[PDB]
Amino acid sequence: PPLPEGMQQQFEDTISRDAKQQPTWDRAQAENVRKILESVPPIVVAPEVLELKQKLADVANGKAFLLQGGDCAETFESNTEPHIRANVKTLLQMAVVLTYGASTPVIKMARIAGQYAKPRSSDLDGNGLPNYRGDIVNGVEATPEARRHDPARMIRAYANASAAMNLVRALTSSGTADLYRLSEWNREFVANSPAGARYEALAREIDSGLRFMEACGVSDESLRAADIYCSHEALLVDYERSMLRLATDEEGNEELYDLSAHQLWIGERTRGMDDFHVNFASMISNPIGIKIGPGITPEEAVAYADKLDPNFEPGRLTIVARMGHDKVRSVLPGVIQAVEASGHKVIWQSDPMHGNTFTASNGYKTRHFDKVIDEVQGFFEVHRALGTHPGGIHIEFTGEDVTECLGGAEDITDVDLPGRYESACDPRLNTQQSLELAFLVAEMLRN
Amino acid sequence: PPLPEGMQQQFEDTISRDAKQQPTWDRAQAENVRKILESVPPIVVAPEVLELKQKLADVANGKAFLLQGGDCAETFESNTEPHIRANVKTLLQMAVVLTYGASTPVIKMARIAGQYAKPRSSDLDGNGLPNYRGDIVNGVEATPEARRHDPARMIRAYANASAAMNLVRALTSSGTADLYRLSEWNREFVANSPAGARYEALAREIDSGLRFMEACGVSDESLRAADIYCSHEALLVDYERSMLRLATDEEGNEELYDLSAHQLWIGERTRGMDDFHVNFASMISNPIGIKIGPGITPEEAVAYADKLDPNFEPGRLTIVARMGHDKVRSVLPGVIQAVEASGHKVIWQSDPMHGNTFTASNGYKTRHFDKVIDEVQGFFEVHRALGTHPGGIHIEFTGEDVTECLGGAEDITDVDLPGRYESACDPRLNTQQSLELAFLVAEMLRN
Amino acid sequence: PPLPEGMQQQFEDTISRDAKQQPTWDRAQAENVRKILESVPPIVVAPEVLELKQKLADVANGKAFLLQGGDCAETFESNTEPHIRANVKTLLQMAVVLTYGASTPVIKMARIAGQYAKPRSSDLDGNGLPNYRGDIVNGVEATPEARRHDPARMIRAYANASAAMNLVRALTSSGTADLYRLSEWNREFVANSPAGARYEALAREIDSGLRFMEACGVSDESLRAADIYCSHEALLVDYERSMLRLATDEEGNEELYDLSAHQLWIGERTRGMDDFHVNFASMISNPIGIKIGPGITPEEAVAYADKLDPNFEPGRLTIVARMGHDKVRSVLPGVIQAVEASGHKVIWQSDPMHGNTFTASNGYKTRHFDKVIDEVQGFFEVHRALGTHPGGIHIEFTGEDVTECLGGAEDITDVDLPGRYESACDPRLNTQQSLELAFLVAEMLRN
Amino acid sequence: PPLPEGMQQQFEDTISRDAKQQPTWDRAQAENVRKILESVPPIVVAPEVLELKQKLADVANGKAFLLQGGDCAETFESNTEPHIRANVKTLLQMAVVLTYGASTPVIKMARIAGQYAKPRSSDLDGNGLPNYRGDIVNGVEATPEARRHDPARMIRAYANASAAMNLVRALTSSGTADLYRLSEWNREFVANSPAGARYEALAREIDSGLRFMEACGVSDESLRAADIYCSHEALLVDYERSMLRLATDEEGNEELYDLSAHQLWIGERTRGMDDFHVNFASMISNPIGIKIGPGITPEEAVAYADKLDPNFEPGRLTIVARMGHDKVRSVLPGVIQAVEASGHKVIWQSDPMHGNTFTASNGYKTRHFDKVIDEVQGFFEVHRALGTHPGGIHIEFTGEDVTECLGGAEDITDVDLPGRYESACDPRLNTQQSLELAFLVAEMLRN
Ligand SMILES: N[C@@H](Cc1c[nH]c2ccccc12)C(=O)O
Ligand SMILES: N[C@@H](Cc1c[nH]c2ccccc12)C(=O)O
Numbered sequence A, B, C, D: 001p002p003l004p005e006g007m008q009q010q011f012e013d014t015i016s017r018d019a020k021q022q023p024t025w026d027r028a029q030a031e032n033v034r035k036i037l038e039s040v041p042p043i044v045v046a047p048e049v050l051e052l053k054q055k056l057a058d059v060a061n062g063k064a065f066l067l068q069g070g071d072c073a074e075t076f077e078s079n080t081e082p083h084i085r086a087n088v089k090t091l092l093q094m095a096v097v098l099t100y101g102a103s104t105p106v107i108k109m110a111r112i113a114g115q116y117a118k119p120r121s122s123d124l125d126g127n128g129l130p131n132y133r134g135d136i137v138n139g140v141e142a143t144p145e146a147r148r149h150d151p152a153r154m155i156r157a158y159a160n161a162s163a164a165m166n167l168v169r170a171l172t173s174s175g176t177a178d179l180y181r182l183s184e185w186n187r188e189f190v191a192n193s194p195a196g197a198r199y200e201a202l203a204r205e206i207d208s209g210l211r212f213m214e215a216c217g218v219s220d221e222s223l224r225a226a227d228i229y230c231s232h233e234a235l236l237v238d239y240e241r242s243m244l245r246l247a248t249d250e251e252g253n254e255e256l257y258d259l260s261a262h263q264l265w266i267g268e269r270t271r272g273m274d275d276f277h278v279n280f281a282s283m284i285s286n287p288i289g290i291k292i293g294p295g296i297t298p299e300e301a302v303a304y305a306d307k308l309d310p311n312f313e314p315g316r317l318t319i320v321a322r323m324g325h326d327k328v329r330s331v332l333p334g335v336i337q338a339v340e341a342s343g344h345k346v347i348w349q350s351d352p353m354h355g356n357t358f359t360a361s362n363g364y365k366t367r368h369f370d371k372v373i374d375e376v377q378g379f380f381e382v383h384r385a386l387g388t389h390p391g392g393i394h395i396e397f398t399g400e401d402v403t404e405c406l407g408g409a410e411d412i413t414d415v416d417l418p419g420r421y422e423s424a425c426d427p428r429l430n431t432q433q434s435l436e437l438a439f440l441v442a443e444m445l446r447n
C-alpha cells in the first residue's frame, strides 16, 4: 500500500502514540484481517460525509438540532431485521417531535453499523477470565473459550455493519420514514401511555401541523423519506485504520476519510492529547465527537478544540457533555465560555446517560429516568442563561419493550428489572421512555 | 347572434320570466350596451370555472371549506389598487387561519369584479328622487341628475370588473399571497389587538406549523401563491345575459357559462321558482349560490335543490343561510334534513350579515359583532348536532380601518360610527374585526 | 397630487420637452381623462416588473432569449377573446421551439394591453381629413366624424388593456400554456405545412425531448403554465404619465414605475435626446426598449445607453435593430463594438419588420417573408462573427389565417393579398408564417 | 422455526424436488450455515419488491423498458468499491441513452449482490480436481485445497452481497446517479470513441433534451438520483431458502418473499417443471425471470407461464430469450404468439450473450460484438413484425477497460484477448462496447 502525500509523515506519527482500551491478540493475524479490510466496500461514501459536515455546520450555527442514539453496544446476535427496524422507528418517531419542538431541521445520527467495541469494563473480571469487550473483540459467553480475543471478529463486525446500513438505507427509502406514518405511531404512544395526558397537548399540535401541510397542497417530495446517518466510538486501532480511504473532492481536492461511519467519536477513556485517537481524529476529514466528563477543565476543552478543529470549520467538532444531573450546571458554563471565546463554533451535545450510571442494589446496573431528564434540563438552563445554542442530545435506547431504566411513565422500579434485560452493556431507554424523553426535550426547546 | 342548440328553446323561455329588482331605463339603448358586451373578453374562462366546480365538490363532501366575502357593494370610486389590495390581504389573512383551524383546504371566493348591482333599497326614496341601486345602474349623489338610470354604467362596470380581476391575478402571482408573509401580518394583528391575548394560543400554534414546514425542507411550490376566485349577485338581466359564452369541454362536450364571474349567486328578493334568475341559473353551468331567509320552508329548499342541481352533482349548489342569531338554530335543521334526505350534497354556507341588520338609533344602520358571531356559533351547533358539514361562510368586510359594525376587540359603540363610514350599502367588518372573526370561526371548526 | 421627492425637479423638466407624434385635442378635457386614470388599478404591478428586470438581466448576460411580438396596432374591435387566444397560442407555440433551439429560457413579451397608439402615418391624409392614429386617439372609419381626436379614447384603451391582461393571466394559469398541448399543436403545423418536411427534423427532436422529460418522472410544476409579459410603444404623453405609480421595494426603497405595461419601448420617431420620451424613460424604473434605424451612428447609440442605463444595470436597456436585410450587416457591428466597449450589457434585439415595409404594387403595403428572415439571418451572422449574444427578436404577427406578408410556405403572392387583410397598420405574419419563422430562428440559434 | 400457514404443505413438496447444479458438501454443516442466514438482515425489503412488481407491470404493458446486467460471476476478490462504481456508472450511462431512445422509463436491474453461484462448467475438470462453481461454493485457484466445496462461503457471499447493495444505495443517493453528470461522461465516450461519429447524432440530441429541461425551469427532484434494483440466478438451494422471509402487505395481507434480491431468475439448466427451482419460484412473491434456449417449444413456454404466473399478474414473469443471432428470428415468434394468446403479459427480454459463446481458437472463450448486436436486432425485428413489445435486454458487462469480446469500435481481434482478461466465467462487454451497445439499441427502439 503506497503513501498518500504529506499525510504519511503525520500518519506514521499517529500510529506511534499509545492507544488505551486496545485488545490483546495475535499481531500477524490482526494485520491480515486489516489488509483484508483495506480493500472492501466502505460502509459510507465521501459525498455523504460532506453532506453531514454541511448539515452539522448548520447545527453549530443555531439553525439545526442533532439527534444521536441507539444501542449502547450492538451485538451480532441482536443485529437483526426486527431489532434494527424498531431502533430506526423510535429514532425517527423522536425526530419528528424534536423537529416540531425545536422549529428546526433535526439531523438523525445513529449508534449503528460499527458500535461493537466497548471500553467501560474494568481490565480483568472475577473468576480470572477476560470480561466482555464487544462482539468485535470477544463473545458474551462466560467461558475462557469465548472471551479469548479474536481478530476475525473485525471482519464479522464489518459484515454486520454493512448489513445494518444496507437495511437502514432500504428502510428509509421504502417508507418506514414516512412522516404521516410516524406521527400515527406517536398518537398510539400518547393514547396508550400512562402520562400521555401531559403530552397530548403537543400531540394534537403536531397533528394539526401535519393536516395543515396537506391542506396547503404541499407536494410530498421531502415527506416520504429521511436520512439516518451513522456513528460509533472509534475505539479499535486496527479496525478504524483499515477503513481509511482517500477521496478527491470537487476540483481534484484530495482528502482522507474513515468510512467505517459518517461520524466517528472519541470516548472518555481514549481521550489523551498525545494518544492515538485524538491524533487519528484530527487527521481524518470526518466530523468528530468527543466525550467530556466532570474532570474536564475549560483549559483542556480549548486545547482539544484547537487540535481537532484547526481551521475553525463550524460543526467539525461536537463536544458531548456527560456530567451527571448535579454537576452539569456547575462544570459546563466555564467550558462553553472559554470555547466560544476561542472562536470555535462546536456543537454542544448532551449525553445524559454515561453520567448517571449507578449499581441498582439488585445485581444489575441502571439509570433513573427523572435524573436523565434533569441533566438535559440543566443542559438547556445553562444554554438559555449563557445565550448559546443547545446543539443536540446523545441518548442510549432500544425499540424493544425492555426494563433497564427506572422511572418513566411505566413506573419501573427495582423489582421490575429482571423481567426483561437484554443489553450487552449500559442500560437503554424503553421504547415508551425514549418517546417520552423526546416530548419533554421538545417542551424545553420551546421555552 | 345564432342559436346554440336545444338551449335556445330553454333560453327564450328563461327571458319570458319576470325579473324583480330590475332597472328602469331605455331599452333600445340597453340592447346596444348588451350587444357590445356580447363580444368583449370575459372576466373569467371556462377551465377556471371547471376547477372551481371540482374544488366545490370537495367542500360539499366534507373535504374543504369555503371563504366568501368582500365589499357589500363595490363602487367605481372605491375600485382602486390600495383598496383591492387590502380586501385581498384580509381575505387571505383570514384564509390561512381557517385553513389551519378546519384542517382542510380553504377555497377563497370574493365579492369583487361585478358586485355593483344592489337590491336592498326600497323602491322609491324620500324627496321623490330614485335611491342608490349600485354604480352599475346609477350614482351615489343625492341629485336627480346622478340617480337617473344609465345603461352605459354596464360597460363602466365591465371595465372596472376586468380591472379588478386583472389586479387580483397579478397580486396573487406577485406574492401578496405568500403564506409566510400573511402570517407575519397576522402576528402584527394579534400583538396589536386588545383581545389578542385570547387568540395568541392559535397564533403561536400556526407559527409553529409554518416553522415545522420549513424544518421538514418542504419545497415552496404551493406556498408562494393562492387562487382567489370571484363572485357577485347575478341581479341584472342585461348584464348577465351579455356575459353568456359557449365553451366546449374535453372530448368536444359543449356547455353554456356566464363568465361575468366564476360563481354567481341568487338573492333573497329575486328568488322565485318561475322568475328569471332561478331559471337563468339552472341553464348556466357555473356553480351557484342561493340566499335563504327565515321564511324558507324545507319543502321549498328541496324544490330549489331539484331545479338548480338536476343531476345531483355535489358542490353545484351552495345554500346560504342568512337567518339572524336567534332564528338560525330553529329554522335551519329542518331544511338540512329534508335536503340531505333528497340526495343533494350542497354546500351549507352561513351568511351572518344580512340577517342581523338593524337601524342603530343614530341615523346609520349597523350590525353588532357579538350577534354576527352568534349566528355562526349556532350554524355550527346545528351541524355538530345533526352530523352534517359546515361548508363555509359569507361575510361582508373591508381592509380599511372603518367603524361600521359595533362591538369587536376595538369596543366600537354608537358614538364611534360617524368617525369613518365609507360603505355604499350594508355595514362591513373592520380589518381588525374580520381577522378576529376568522380566529373565532377557527376555534369552532376545531371543536 | 403631491410630489414624490427629488423626482419632481426631474419630472417637471421631463414634461417641458417637446414630444413628437402627439394628438391634437382639448387640453382641459384630456387633463380630466388623465386625473381619472391617475387613480385606477394598474395593468401590472411593481413586483412583476422587478421579476422582468431580473429575467432581462439574464438575457443581457447570454443566459436567456427574448421573444417579443403580437399585433402592430391593437384595435378595440379586434380585442376579443378568440383573437387574444390565437396571439397568445402562436406566441407560446413559437416560444417552445425557440426555447429548444436556443437551449435557454425564452422570456415571452407581447405587443398587447396598450399597443393602440400609432405614429407611422404621415401627418395629414388625402381628402383633407386626419388619418388613423390608433384607437386610443381616433377611429378607423374614413369620415371627419370618426377621425376627430378624442381624449375619452384613453379610458377606452385602459379598459381594453385591463381586459386583455386579465385574459392572458387567466389563459396562462388555465393551461393554454401547457407545454405538451403546445407541441401537439406544433405537430399539427409541421404535418399540415407545405415546407414541413424541412422542419420535421426539429419537430421529432422536440417530441423526443418531451417524452424524455416524462420518462425521467419529472414533476410538472413548471410545465403546465408560462409567464407572458406585456409591452407597447410609450407614444402618448397623457396616457403614460397618468399610469405613473410609486412603489416601495424591499427595505423601504422607493421607486417610480409606469404600470401601463411591464416593459415600455421608444420608437424611431420620438427618439430625441432632449425630447419627452427618452427623458420620461430614463426617469421610470421599468425595463426599456429603443428602436434603432440605419441612420444611427455608434456615437449616438452610446449616448442613448449612457442616459437610459446610467447605472450599468444589465438588461435595463434593450436595443432594437430594425435596419433592412441589406443594411443590417453593414450598420450594426460598429454600434455593438462601441456599446459593448462603453461597459453596457444591453439586450440586442432584431426587428426584421419595420425595416422591410414596401408598397406592394397592389394598393396594399407588405413585407416579403424571405427578406424578413434574411435580416435575422444577418443579425446572427453579425453576433456569431463579433462573438456577442443575440438577445431576442421583435416580430409582428397574428393568430388568424390572414394574407398580409408575401412568400412563406403558403406561397402568398401579390394576387393573394385582398383575400384577407385585417391589419389596422403594418402587415403581420400569418399563423403559418409565424411558426415557420420560429423554426428557422431556432436553426440559427443552434449553429 | 414454525410454519407459515398453507404454504408449509407446498414448501415441503418444493424441497422434495431434485435440484440440478447443486454443490456437494457436508449437510450438517450446511444446515448450520442456513440456520445462521435465517436470522440476518435481508439484502432487500418487501416494499421495494412491491415497487419493482408495479414498475415491471408497466414494462409488460408497453409503458417501460428493462435494463438488466453486470458481471457474469461476481468474485469476492472483485467485489470492491472501484469495480462496483464502474459497473453502476456504465449501467446508468447506458440507461440514460435507452431512456431517451425508448421514450419510456428504463428500469435498472443489476447482476450484483448475489451473482456468485455459477452452473455453466461441465461436472468435472481436467486433472481430476473439481472446476470453479463460483465464490459461493469454491475458489478460483487450481488446487484441490481451494476447489473443495465449502458451506461457509454462503456466509461470505451474504457478507459481500450486503456490502455491495449498501454501496449502490449510497452511490445512488450520493449523486453518481446525477443525470447531467452521466451525460457529461457519455460525451467523453462519443468524443473519444473511434466510431463515435456515427453516435454523435444521438449524443447532441440527448444534450439538447437536457438543456431544454433546464431551460424549462424544471425542478431537479427526480434528476439527481436513480433506483438500481438487484438480481441474481437463484441457483443454490440452501442459500435461497435461508433468505425466505414472511412480509405482511397493506391490510394485513401475508406473503412470502426471497429477499436475497429484488428479482430472482431461473437458468437454462435448472429449468425442470417438477424440479426445485420452478416450484420454488412459483411459491415466492418476487418478480421472476426464466432463461429460454432454442430447444424451447411454444407448448412448454405456455406451461411455464401458467405455473410461474398463475394469476395473470402482468410483469410477474420475465421471459429471457437467449437463442443465438441465427436462431432468434426463427424460434421466438411461435413462442410469443402462443404466450400472448394464453393471456399472459410477460416481459420479453433479450439475452444476446449466453447464445453466442464460442471458443476463440486461442484457449479463451469469447463472443463477437457484431453477432451480439444481431441477436437484439432480430429480437426487435420479431417484435416490430408481430406487433408486441420489446421489454428489455440482459447483457453481461464490466466497467473496466478489458478485452474479452471481439469487434466493437475498439477493433478487438483474437490477438488482443490475453492483454487483459479478468472474468471468472463468461466474457463481458468492455466499457466502450457496453455504451456502444446501448446507442445501437436506442436506434432500434426509435425505428
Ligand atoms: N425529509 C425531511 C422530513 C422528514 C421525513 N421523515 C422524517 C422523520 C422525522 C423527521 C423529519 C422527517 C427530514 O428529513 O427532515
Ligand atoms: N396554495 C395553497 C397554500 C396557500 C398559499 N397562500 C395561501 C393563503 C391562504 C391560505 C392558503 C394559502 C392554497 O391556496 O391553499
Ligand SMILES: N[C@@H](Cc1c[nH]c2ccccc12)C(=O)O
Pocket: C092, C093, C095, C096, C099, C105, C106, C177, C178, C179, C182, C222, C223, C224, C225, C226, C227, D215, D216, D217
Ligand atoms: N414554465 C416554463 C416552461 C413552459 C411552460 N409553458 C411554456 C411555453 C413555452 C415555453 C416554455 C414553457 C417557462 O415558462 O419557460
Ligand SMILES: N[C@@H](Cc1c[nH]c2ccccc12)C(=O)O
Pocket: C215, C216, C217, D092, D093, D095, D096, D099, D105, D106, D177, D178, D179, D182, D222, D223, D224, D225, D226, D227
Ligand atoms: N429518477 C429518474 C431520472 C434519472 C435520474 N438518473 C438517471 C440515470 C439514468 C436514467 C434515468 C435517470 C429515473 O430513475 O428514471
Ligand SMILES: [Mn+2]
Pocket: A072, A073, A353, A354, A396, A425, A426
Ligand atoms: Mn453506553
Ligand SMILES: [Mn+2]
Pocket: B072, B073, B353, B354, B396, B425, B426
Ligand atoms: Mn350586503
Ligand SMILES: [Mn+2]
Pocket: C072, C073, C353, C354, C396, C425, C426
Ligand atoms: Mn408595426
Ligand SMILES: [Mn+2]
Pocket: D072, D073, D353, D354, D396, D425, D426
Ligand atoms: Mn454469463
